[PDB]
Enzyme design. Structure first.
Site, mmCIF file in Angstrom:
data_model
loop_
_atom_site.group_PDB
_atom_site.id
_atom_site.type_symbol
_atom_site.label_atom_id
_atom_site.label_comp_id
_atom_site.label_asym_id
_atom_site.label_seq_id
_atom_site.Cartn_x
_atom_site.Cartn_y
_atom_site.Cartn_z
ATOM 1 N N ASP A 1 0.782 -1.234 0.000
ATOM 2 C CA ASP A 1 0.000 0.000 0.000
ATOM 3 C C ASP A 1 0.817 1.290 0.000
ATOM 4 O OD1 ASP A 1 -2.346 -1.271 -0.177
ATOM 5 O OD2 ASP A 1 -2.969 -0.999 1.932
ATOM 6 N N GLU B 1 -3.034 -5.668 1.040
ATOM 7 C CA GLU B 1 -3.977 -5.988 -0.016
ATOM 8 C C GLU B 1 -4.468 -7.417 -0.095
ATOM 9 O OE1 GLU B 1 -2.132 -3.891 -2.896
ATOM 10 O OE2 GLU B 1 -0.315 -5.096 -3.134
HETATM 11 MG MG LIG Z 1 0.010 -2.635 -3.920
HETATM 12 MG MG LIG Z 2 -5.073 -1.911 1.839
#
Ligand SMILES: [Mg+2]
Ligand SMILES: [Mg+2]
EC number: 3.1.-.-
Length: 177
Positions: free
Chosen positions: A16, A112
Site C-alpha cells: 500500500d 492488499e
Molecule cells: Mg500494492
Molecule cells: Mg489496503
DNA sequence: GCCTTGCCGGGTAA
DNA sequence: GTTCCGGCGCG
DNA sequence: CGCGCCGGAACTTAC
DNA sequence: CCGGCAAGGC
C-alpha cells in the site's frame, strides 16, 4: 530484531505504499518511505509507532510525516538512509528467514489481502512477488494458486486454499512478530 | 447440499 | 499509489 | 553548486 | 478489494 518489524513494514510498503527516489529542480533530491491507508487510527496508532521504533533503532533523524489526502492518509519518512534500508531489504527478499517471511506476508495481507476472510486472497500486479510468497506458503503448508485475475489492469491473484484456512489465519494473521 | 475457486465487473482505497 | 511544487538546510 | 529533509497537493490507478 | 455466479468435486 526488528528484522521482524521491518519485514512487516516492508509488506505494508510494497502493498500500500512505495519507495521513492525523487529528482527535483535542481539538482535537488529526496528519498521517501511511504505507507498509505484510509484509517487515520490504524496509521497513527499501530503503523506509526512501529516505524518510530525502527527510526530510533537505526538512528534515522528524519521525522515521521502523516499527510492528509482526500481519500487516504499518507505516512511518510523522508530519509535516504531509511530508503536504502528497505530498498536493499527488498532486493534481498528471496533470502528472508521464516520469521521475516511470516511478518512480510502478514504485512502484505494487511495491505492488499481479502479482508472479508470469506476467501483468502492477495492481489498484485507483480507476479514474481506472488510466486515468491506462493513458495513460502507451500513450505509453511498452506496450499495456494496464482492466476491473472483482472485483465483490465494486469492484476494477478494469489488464492489461499480454504482447506488450509486454519493454518493460514493462525500462522500468518495472528502471528506475533 | 455444500464447499471451493476461476471468472469478471463495479468503484473504493490506495 | 506516484510525482510534481516551493521551501529550507547544509558542506 | 550540489544534494538531502519538509509540507503539500495534484495526479493516477491497483487492488 | 469486493462479491455474485457457475462449474467441479466430495
Ligand atoms: Mg500494492
Ligand atoms: Mg489496503
Amino acid at each position: 530484531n526488528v528484522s521482524g518489524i521491518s519485514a512487516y513494514l516492508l509488506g505494508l510498503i510494497i502493498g500500500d505504499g512505495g519507495l521513492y527516489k525523487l529528482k527535483y529542480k535542481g539538482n535537488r533530491s529526496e528519498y521517501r518511505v511511504v505507507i498509505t491507508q484510509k484509517s487515520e487510527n490504524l496509521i497513527k496508532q499501530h503503523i506509526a509507532p512501529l516505524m518510530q521504533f525502527l527510526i530510533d533503532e537505526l538512528n534515522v533523524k528524519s521525522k515521521i510525516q502523516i499527510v492528509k489526502g482526500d481519500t487516504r492518509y499518507e505516512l511518510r519518512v523522508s530519509s535516504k538512509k531509511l530508503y536504502y534500508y528497505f530498498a536493499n531489504m527488498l532486493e534481498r527478499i528471496r533470502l528472508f528467514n521464516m520469521r521475516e517471511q511470516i511478518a512480510f506476508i502478514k504485512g502484505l495481507y494487511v495491505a492488499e489481502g481479502d479482508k472479508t476472510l470469506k476467501r483468502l486472497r492477495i492481489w498484485n500486479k507483480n507476479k514474481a512477488l506472488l510466486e515468491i510468497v506462493s513458495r513460502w506458503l507451500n513450505n509453511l503448508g498452506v496450499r495456494n494458486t496464482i492466476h491473472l485475475d483482472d485483465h483490465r489492469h494486469g492484476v494477478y491473484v494469489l488464492n489461499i486454499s480454504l482447506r488450509d484456512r486454519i493454518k493460514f489465519v493462525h500462522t500468518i494473521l495472528s502471528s506475533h512478530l
